[PDB]
Amino acid sequence: EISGHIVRSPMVGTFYRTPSPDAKAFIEVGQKVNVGDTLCIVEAMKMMNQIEADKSGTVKAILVESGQPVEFDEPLVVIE
């Protein structure tokens, strides 16, 4: 059912929506993003990987909640 371009995790770690515990989220559903825009962060033992959009579009859905563990290739964000 999930149609659109799916941005997947490039690593095993913990998913975060924000640049810090007190900051606002990089993106929200309905937001337009451009190639290169940071969508989220996946962290593993303090190694923090900033996941960027590989194509421009609108954020259709965010599939994981902040603080949740993600696997390699796990769907994170859908862009339409």
Residues that bind ligand BTN (CB under 6 A): 16, 18-21, 41, 43, 46, 48
Complex with ligand BTN: residue 4 or 19, whichever CB lies closer: 19
User: One symbol per residue from 35 to 74: x for binding a copy of itself (CB under 8 A), - otherwise; what is it?
Assistant: -----------------------x-xxxx-xx--------
Please give the Cα distance from 7 to 41 (Å, whole number): 12
Minimum Å distance from CB 80 to ligand BTN?
A: 25
Q: Which two tokens stand for residue 35?
A: 């190639």
Which does residue 41 touch among ligand BTN, a copy of itself, none (CB within 5 to 8 A, set by kind)?
ligand BTN
Q: DSSP string covering 3-67, please?
A: -SEEEE-SSSEEEESSSSTTSPPS--TT-EE-TT-EEEEEEETTEEEEEE-SS-EEEEEE-S-TT
* Segment interacting with a copy of itself, rule: CB under 8 A, options 8-16, 25-33, 41-49: 25-33
